[PDB]
Amino acid sequence: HHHHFNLPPGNYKKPKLLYCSNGGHFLRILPDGTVDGTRDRSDQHIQFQLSAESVGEVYIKSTETGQYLAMDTDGLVYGSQTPNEECLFLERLEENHYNTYISKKHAEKNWFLGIKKNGSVKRGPRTHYGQKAILFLPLPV
Hints:
The protein is mainly beta. It has strands spanning about 15-20, 25-30, 35-40, 45-55, 55-60, 70, 75-80, 90-95, 100-105, 135-140.
């Protein structure tokens, strides 16, 4: 409805690292549910298992902790112990080669997952099409 349907080649079979090209950070969920970006390729909290719920709809789960990436009503990204509506993301291809993650619940507002150059995760409303912060590369673990 609100977005295009260009999809990235499949990437759920194996766990992946979600590399943000903006500042070169790996998405990370700390045990306390804190979400940020880290440049430390040796972190034990940057590995995720993605799975398709519906074509183009995914869940992003931390393999270390089992926490699910989610986005709250206020646009803040957090780690959810259990899967819910806030955990569904629209996985799309962007600029022909990257992956973008749009909050399903907030799809009409174009709220995305994105990381600033300083490694801080962005609030939903601060993100938008055209930004570098929303571009991810799923890398092998």
